[PDB]
Design a protein around this ligand. Structure first.
Ligand SMILES: CC(C)(C)[C@H](NC(=O)C(F)(F)F)C(=O)N1C[C@H]2[C@@H]([C@H]1C(=O)N[C@H](C=N)C[C@@H]1CCNC1=O)C2(C)C
Ligand SMILES: CC(C)(C)[C@H](NC(=O)C(F)(F)F)C(=O)N1C[C@H]2[C@@H]([C@H]1C(=O)N[C@H](C=N)C[C@@H]1CCNC1=O)C2(C)C
Lengths: 299, 303
């Protein structure tokens, strides 16, 4: 049972490089539009305190250098949508997949295609944390890298990368340019709210451990949903809803372990610790697999 | 804070096809005008219990092989067996063929796996070849013929093709010349993974990654010789280091100023006493599936 990303090829064909002045990052080329973070228009000094509408009105189409591989694409229009710049180009991307833009919920997962200078570097799976950060792997020049899910050859883009917080976690926007979380695209110290653990995901992963032959953490105790949620909240876990209980249905049916019985297992894990033992090779309780991720990999 | 990162899979996605004989369907790799796939595609389920591959291949002709890119059939114009892989010559050169090499990897080396079903890629993840020549993969029915690979400057180095799952849940397969990693055979008969060991060179790479990020409490004031370290390491079920291992740690040793043998002595102390209550890179366990290249790959912005 591995952290598994979606195949990245459909997104690789959309990555380009965008340069304004001496600022270079990545863009997403779909049909005849390139989407990228608006701070590409900032000088280093601008980034410390940008007025973006004031900065953008001072730019012309020819200030944007867009490169697809070695070929330059001519920008013939530009507009700003929240924190995303949309560059209209005179060329349509023949590799444009069927796609949608979606805004994801905390706890949901997606694949990231990390890119530099318009070229793909690596692919990995992330979760939107409850505090709306992501624990990514991004370096200088990674901005405009995107996160996505793939469903029957349709790519749902959900994340575009903008920044790294001082704790090392990452922040960005949806493809409409709206940040996840209380962050702004200004170079200034920013903290996130206190994070919490994605309870429904921990339960899905505990089911993954049972599907793969590991059961040491199970017990005969029992819990109600409300009594479990009281303990979960005490340990900085997110509440478990009836909707979550229902989504876990297929995993409980496959394993014959009632959802509330797995809740009692997790309650014991939280109250006693793991005693130096491991679950699926992990010393900590993993919360970045959704129920759907577990089903997709185990079935 | 240091996670597994797969290579972008697009160059390999463009090479995946499906291969069917009878009702047995698996994945194949289409490069130029040849499709490579596991030879047990020619077996019925009953054949797999005790196959005579040479005799089974005698009874097959080109017209018995259904090769499809999606729903599009590729006409087979020749077939041959090379160890445990079948090579089907087709009448169309794949226009998506990347620059590529076939390589046989060492234990400890990592690669990306593109898990595929019915020729359709489903997911991508990183794997290490264990010292017992298994991989801790994630594979379901129909996954055979999925490949593992590394990329270096637009050249895809294919190193693994998937064939089978062992009773402990780990996986075994071949290089792209059809030679198994490890003592395994492509027959549905009782087989077992041997005892595994910890990949020392990768643990050292992980300790260097910790040092790069300022996590260096475990740096001691001692050193060791390679031979003394190798003999102690084996007592803790750690792999001995080769001369090649020492050299592939060279770049990380230069970056940090920590000599390889000094880091070996630091690791020895962890094995004999260490951790206590402390963590390294936020982990109480020593990670052994990051190579020195993987550390450098993720700390640089390669490609
Ligand atoms: C890291 C840092 C001190 C620099 C800064 N962060 C904060 O100022 C914060 F703390 F508010 F987040 C920061 O990220 N930026 C400052 C400036 C852009 C952004 C930025 O350089 N983005 C990079 C895009 N190519 C990706 C980064 C690079 C390192 N790893 C990443 O992911 C804008 C917010 C306009
Ligand atoms: C696990 C099973 C008991 C079925 C058997 N294993 C052993 O006989 C062993 F234990 F000896 F290894 C086994 O894998 N096979 C039996 C038969 C082929 C192979 C096989 O079905 N390969 C699948 C390719 N599509 C991938 C498998 C499916 C489940 N997960 C996988 O990865 C051959 C060895 C010729």
């Amino acid at each position: 049972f591995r952290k598994m990303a979606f195949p990245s090829g459909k997104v690789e064909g959309c990555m380009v490089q965008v340069t304004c002045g001496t600022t270079t990052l990545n863009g997403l080329w779909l049909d005849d539009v390139v989407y990228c973070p608006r701070h590409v228009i900032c000088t280093s000094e601008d980034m410390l305190n940008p007025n973006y509408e004031d900065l953008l009105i001072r730019k012309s189409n020819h200030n944007f250098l867009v490169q697809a591989g070695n070929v330059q694409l001519r920008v013939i229009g530009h507009s700003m949508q929240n924190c995303v710049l949309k560059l209209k180009v005179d060329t349509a991307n023949p590799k444009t997949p069927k796609y949608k833009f979606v805004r994801i919920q905390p706890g949901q997962t997606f694949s990231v295609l990390a890119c530099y200078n318009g070229s793909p570097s690596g692919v990995y799976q992330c979760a939107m944390r409850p505090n709306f950060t992501i624990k990514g792997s991004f370096l200088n020049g990674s901005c405009g890298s995107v996160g996505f899910n793939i469903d029957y050859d349709c790519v749902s883009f959900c994340y575009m990368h903008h920044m790294e917080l001082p704790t090392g976690v990452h922040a960005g926007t949806d493809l409409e340019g709206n940040f996840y979380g209380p962050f702004v695209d200004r170079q200034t110290a920013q903290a996130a709210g206190t994070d919490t653990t994605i309870t429904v995901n921990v339960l899905a992963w505990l089911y993954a451990a049972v599907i793969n032959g590991d059961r040491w953490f199970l017990n005969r105790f029992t819990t109600t949903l409300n009594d479990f949620n009281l303990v979960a909240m005490k340990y900085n876990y997110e509440p478990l809803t009836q909707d979550h209980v229902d989504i876990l249905g297929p995993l409980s049916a496959q394993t014959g372990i009632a959802v509330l019985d797995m809740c009692a297992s997790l309650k014991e894990l939280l109250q006693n610790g793991m005693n130096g033992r491991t679950i699926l090779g992990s010393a900590l309780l993993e919360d970045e697999f959704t129920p759907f991720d577990v089903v997709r990999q185990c079935s």
